[PDB]
Amino acid sequence: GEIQWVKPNKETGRLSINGPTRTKLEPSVFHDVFEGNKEPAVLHSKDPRLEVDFEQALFSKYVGNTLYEPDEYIKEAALHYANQLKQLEINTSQMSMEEACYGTENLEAIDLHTSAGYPYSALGIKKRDILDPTTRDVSKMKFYMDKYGLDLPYSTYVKDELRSIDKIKKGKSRLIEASSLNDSVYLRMAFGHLYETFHANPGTITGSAVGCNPDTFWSKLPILLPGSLFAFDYSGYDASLSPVWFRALELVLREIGYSEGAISLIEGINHTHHVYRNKTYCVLGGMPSGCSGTSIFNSMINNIIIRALLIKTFKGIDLDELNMVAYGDDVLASYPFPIDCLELAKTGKEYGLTMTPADKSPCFNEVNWDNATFLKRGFLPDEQFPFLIHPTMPMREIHESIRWTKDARNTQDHVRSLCLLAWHNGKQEYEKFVSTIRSVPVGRALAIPNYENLRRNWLELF
C-alpha cells in the first residue's frame, strides 16, 4: 500500500465528516483497582501526549508497493489454494439484496450500529434510516444505491481504542477505513455465498478461522494442525500488501468460477479513495482496515502469501502437506517437519511484508502448543479432559481492559464479558481475578458468574 496523492476537500468536492475529536473511553471504577499502562489512542493532531507529527505518523503504515504483478511463485500459490477451495463447491451466483442486507443463517445482517459511510455519515443519514430488520425492505436501499452509485470513497477516521503508552507517544493510532454502505451491499451481493460457506466452515479447507467460536474451535485445532507448528506476527499487514496480492486474489476468484463483474470489485478494494476529516487521498494497494466485510479476503490473501513464501524459500516443498488457518493477518500453520522462520521472513521482505516470529527471540524454538498464540489467545488443555482445549486470553489484556469504560452504565455487562474470557486461564487465576473485583464495594455488588457453572456450560458445547 502507498498513498498516490492528497487533495483538500474544497478541490475534490467530497463532503467532510467533522470530527467529534474527543475520546469516549473514560477511567472505570476499577481503574486504580487493577494494574496496567494503556491509555486511549491519540485522536487529534494537537494531543498533549504526542512526540511526533500525528497525521504523518498515521500514514507511515503505507510502506510502499514492491511488486505490481504476480511472478511464477505467486501464481502457483494462488492456484493451489484455488484448487483446494473447489471441494467446498462455493455458489458463485449473485446473492439477492435482501439476504445481503438482512442476513442468512451463515451470514450476519449488516450491523445497524455502525456508520453507513460516504456520503451518509457526512449527511446525517444512518443505517436505521435505510434498513429495517422487521420489514426486511430493500427498496429504500435500491433507492439510495441509485442515488449515489458505487465506487464511493472510504470514510476514514481514528479508532477510539486503548493503546500502549509507546504507541501514544509515537502517535501510532489505528484508522477505521469504512466503505460506503452501497459498496458493502454490492460486495456482499457478489460474494455473499462465499462468505456463507467460509463462516460455516472454519478450518483447513477454507484456510480460515473467520467467525469461529474459540470456545469450541480451539479443541479442533490440534487435530487440524498436526506435526510442527509455525506462526509469526506481521507489522502493519493491511497497509503493507501491494497490488500483486489483489491480482493473485483475482486469479483465485476466477479459478473457482466467478464472473468478471464480481471480480472487478476487487480493484475497487486495491485502488481506493479515502476522506480523512477535510482532505481526500488515493491509496493504491493495501486492504481497507476498519470494517469486517474485509476479513475473509485478508485471510484468503494470507493463504496465498504463506504458500508463495514456502515454495520460493524451499525448492520442491510439498504444498499438499501444509495446513493453515488465518483470521486477517493472524496465521496458525503446521507442517510434518519444522520450517526456518527467519528464512520465510526474508523471503517475505522481498514482497514488502514485515515479519517477526511470535516470541522474543528472534525466532521459533520451535513454537508448539504451550507458547502458541492465535487471536491473542493461548492453548491450554483442560485439566480433567486433556482433549478439550481452553482458549486463554492473557490476564494482562483483561486487566488493561477492565480499567476503562465507554459507558459507566455498562459496568455489569462489561465485567461479565471479561469473566467469560478470564475463567479459561484456570480456577486459580479466576479466583484471583474475582477477588480483586470483590476487593472493592462496587465489585461486591455485581453478579459475577460462578466458575464451575461456566465450566459446566462449556462442557455442554461438546
Ligand SMILES: O=c1[nH]c(=O)n([C@@H]2O[C@H](COP(=O)(O)OP(=O)(O)OP(=O)(O)O)[C@@H](O)[C@H]2O)cc1Br
Ligand atoms: O479497526 C482495525 N482492526 C484491526 O484488527 N486492524 C489490524 O491491525 C493491523 C495493524 O495494526 P498494528 O500496527 O497496531 O499491529 P501490527 O502488529 O500489524 O504492527 P506492530 O505491533 O509491529 O506495531 C492491520 O494489519 C489489521 O489487520 C486494523 C484496524 Br484499523
Ligand code: NI
Ligand atoms: Ni485514486
